[PDB]
Amino acid sequence: SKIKMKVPLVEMDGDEMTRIIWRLIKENLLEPYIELNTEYYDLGLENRDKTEDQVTIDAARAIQKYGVGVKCATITPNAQRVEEYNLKKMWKSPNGTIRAILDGTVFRAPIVVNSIKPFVKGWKKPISIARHAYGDVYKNVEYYVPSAGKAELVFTSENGEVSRQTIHEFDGPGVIMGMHNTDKSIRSFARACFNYALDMNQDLWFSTKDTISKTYDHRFKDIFQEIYENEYKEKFEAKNLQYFYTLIDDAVARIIRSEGGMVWACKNYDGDVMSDMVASAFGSLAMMTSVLVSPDGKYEFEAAHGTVTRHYYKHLKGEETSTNSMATIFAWTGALKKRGELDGIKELVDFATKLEQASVQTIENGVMTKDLASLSEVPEKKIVNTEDFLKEIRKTFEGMA
Amino acid sequence: SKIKMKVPLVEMDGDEMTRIIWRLIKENLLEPYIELNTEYYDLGLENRDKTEDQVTIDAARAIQKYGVGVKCATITPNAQRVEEYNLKKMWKSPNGTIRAILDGTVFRAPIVVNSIKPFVKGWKKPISIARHAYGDVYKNVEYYVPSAGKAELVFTSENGEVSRQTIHEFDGPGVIMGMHNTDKSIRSFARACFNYALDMNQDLWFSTKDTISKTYDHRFKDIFQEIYENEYKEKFEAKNLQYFYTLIDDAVARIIRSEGGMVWACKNYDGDVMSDMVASAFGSLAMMTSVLVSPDGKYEFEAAHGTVTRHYYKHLKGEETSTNSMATIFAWTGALKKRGELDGIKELVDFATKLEQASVQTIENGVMTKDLASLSEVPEKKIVNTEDFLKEIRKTFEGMA
Ligand SMILES: NC(=O)c1ccc[n+]([C@@H]2O[C@H](COP(=O)([O-])OP(=O)(O)OC[C@H]3O[C@@H](n4cnc5c(N)ncnc54)[C@H](OP(=O)(O)O)[C@@H]3O)[C@@H](O)[C@H]2O)c1
Ligand SMILES: NC(=O)c1ccc[n+]([C@@H]2O[C@H](COP(=O)([O-])OP(=O)(O)OC[C@H]3O[C@@H](n4cnc5c(N)ncnc54)[C@H](OP(=O)(O)O)[C@@H]3O)[C@@H](O)[C@H]2O)c1
Ligand SMILES: [Mg+2]
Ligand SMILES: [Mg+2]
């Protein structure tokens, strides 16, 4: 008899290679054990295009309603993808949108396995990213300037006052952009990182470029220090774990040089880049969990990598792939784990935790996709294609479940 | 008889630990061999403060006049430094300013030594950063919004037309920022990177976040592809070296995973962060050269790291330091090498090239500062303080010069 679910998972379907893998994961690792209850939204590019991105919006709202989302990597359009898919427009990141609607903090952490040695010598313990989910460049407005004139950054009070600053005097074509974040949102971001480093029992690092961005970045600096001063210093000193702030360039540099083991808070953009640096450096983009947690307690689970286009094209040429499903497995089990917790289905959480251990265990035993092949200390090794990796995880799981 | 110079070097003095080292390098490694001809500008924070940052400006102009600058790491002020130094204001980055005035591209590359093994397993050859020296956040305007109202990005043609886009509707205090770059400048940046990868005989990678920043970043993408299409494809295919564009998150990820050996072009901000990632990951922030090259042919040599505040404070407490001078040595020899080339003083260029080899050679032989101690494959090792490192380089140089 399959495991039964109460509240539905919001399920958001994706693109290209992850879309393929999303289906294989449901059919081989989930549906045979759980009567999967989800509310389906197809965030595939083709469907986002048919519904003029309305589906993305509805899927956000549904996460708010039911409380947990799991989301497949999707394509974010640019001139190339507009051409490739004949899009009505260059749609905004659906992750940007969902994130804007929920607010919150995306937590990303490698998926560790004993016999998988990181590229960076001396990385002995996981490094977590705590990425601010809201604003900055993900909510920019930009403008191409066609020839000479005047760019201005402009604010108009609810009262009367206006201030204008000059962005630049063009005597030629170039680009401009404006963007924003809100203290409310920084404040949630800072508490979320502090909470999280405690929950994890580690130092929190935070970093920006406050010396160059003297008010915007400088705000994030201040709010963190404030929130730390009179809201966490106490609990922190208590556990003997420090809060560490430095310049973003300095921070990457010390990260590379550390043994890992800290939580690393980053503004939106930096969190994007650094979650790729850290997953890759730990082993593979696929070996990393990602969950958005809204201030208001809602969750979206995802992969941190994108849609593996390159692999997708190879698959379309008829080649076989070796694409690593770990991150999207873990998104499903993360989401199912949380669904269970909230609805009091112990069988769902033990299922999820067991499925997670089977997965890691499978790689520990030397069966893994190409991306890990060269990091493994396992003598006898078995590099498998995309499907076989999943069949093999299923084997190890069934034998221990 | 000391070596004689023709045109003066523009010399820009710095702060804290680099200020100390700048003097030790002149006195032990330069002045005893060269009648040093320079035009001195003190970009120390205290002097920038006394002259209300005018000295920074004059030093830029002088680089333009004479053609080569060498520059010590300087402090860029923030609320903390305003307090620490009782500044009349939070002065703008002097590097930002000089860079804005010259335009150009900052090239940074590790300083390789056989027996110094990078932190990132598999980095077998240098990775170079080619950082756009101009604009974006280094020329931002920012504004704190105090409560509700309307932020707008605004452009006004030289003609009549105005366009306004809404940055955001605040009903609360937060931050906003606007910034720009110009096609002229992107165009020079792109040719500079292409030239440079040829001069180096390697693939050029370039990357941004064009899917999210759909016009601004997307412009950089386009201009690179254009300039490549009909200005370098030919020379490139010719040498069997490819031009590679991907998303910035994807790019860090593939970098970590590559064997190095490419030139990696980055927008201003990203070039800052990534030059720290790469120097650190190669060994130390100190083991990296940096030179701005203006479109109009002018050069500023510098360290890529900052002023080593932490070491400075330790030195002030009376502790001895082990601060690595390599990068600022190399700035001086880079600058002297170029001065020589331009003025036809072969003795100056051979001096500089010899001084560079003595330095590397010294570390090859196992004498080095703390930051390298743990990367060295040299059996018998001699970790020295800041001064001794310099005396030891002097020894090895004198014996081969
Ligand atoms: N929805 C999202 O969270 C998300 C995230 C990032 C990008 N995007 C979208 O995804 C599309 C492609 O982006 P991208 O190519 O830059 O990044 P990507 O999908 O993360 O793929 C980057 C590369 O890293 C390796 N890799 C990533 N995931 C892997 C996995 N599961 N198994 C094995 N190898 C893996 C592959 O490298 P090799 O080819 O070297 O084997 C892959 O080509 C873009 O259109 C972008 O908009 C979506
Ligand atoms: N003018 C510039 O190009 C420049 C560049 C960056 C920063 N800045 C300014 O410099 C000040 C300090 O910035 P920061 O502390 O972030 O960066 P930093 O001066 O580069 O120092 C960062 C850390 O990296 C290690 N390191 C850097 N250079 C070293 C060297 N030559 N020898 C041995 N170790 C070295 C040291 O680490 P350990 O303490 O771990 O030993 C140092 O504390 C800031 O006020 C900033 O505005 C200037
Ligand atoms: Mg990403
Ligand atoms: Mg820097």
CATH at residue B56: 3.40.718.10
Q: Which residue has the tokens 């743990």?
A: B374
**Residue B89 backbone dihedrals phi, psi, to 5 degrees:** -160, 170
Q: Would the CB atoms of B211 and A150 count as touching at under 8 Å?
A: no
- How far apart, in whole angstroms, are the C-alpha atoms of residue A360 and residue A396? 10
A326 neighbors A357 (Cβ within 8 angstroms): no
Number of separate domains in chain B: 1
- How far apart, in whole angstroms, are the C-alpha atoms of residue B281 and residue B267? 20
Pocket around ligand 1 at a 6 A CB cut-off: A 73-76, 95, 284-286, 302, 305-310, 323-324, 327, 369, 371; B 211, 246-247, 250, 253
Report whether A219 belongs to an annotated binding site.
no
B155 neighbors A176 (Cβ within 8 angstroms): yes
**Residue A98 backbone dihedrals phi, psi, to 5 degrees:** -60, -45
- DSSP letter string, B296-350: TS-EEEEESS---HHHHHHHHTT-------HHHHHHHHHHHHHHHHHHT-HHHHH
B337: tokens are 């090498």
Rounded to a whole number of angstroms, the distance from the CA of B393 to the nearest CA of chain A is 26
Instruction: Give the Cβ contact number of residue B198 at 10 Å.
Output: 17
DSSP A376: B
Tell me the CA end-to-end span of chain B in Å, nearest whole number: 14
Q: Give the residue numbers spanning the domain of A360.
A: 1-401
Task: Answer left, alpha or beta for residue B308, where phi above 0 means left and psi between -120 and 50 means alpha.
Answer: left
A181 neighbors A135 (Cβ within 8 angstroms): yes
B306: tokens are 């900052």
Task: Give the A:B interface size as CB pairs under 8 Å.
Answer: 293
Centre of ligand 1 from the C-alpha of residue A213, in Å: 31
- How far apart, in whole angstroms, are the C-alpha atoms of residue A273 and residue A304? 11
Strands in A146-305 per DSSP E:
149-157, 162-170, 174-182, 204-208, 243-247, 263-266, 288-293, 299-303
Q: Would the CB atoms of B180 and A178 count as touching at under 8 Å?
A: no
Q: Would the CB atoms of A219 and B144 count as touching at under 8 Å?
A: yes
Strand pairing class (A149-157; B149-157) = antiparallel
A309 neighbors A18 (Cβ within 8 angstroms): no
Resolution expressed in Å: 2.5
Give B254's strand partners: none
Best interface-test mutation with A: which of B75, B89, B171, B175 has the largest number of A CBs within 10 A?
Answer: B175
- Measured at the alpha carbon of residue B259, what is the angle toward residues B254 and B264, in degrees to the nearest 5? 60
Q: Would the CB atoms of B273 and A277 count as touching at under 8 Å?
A: no
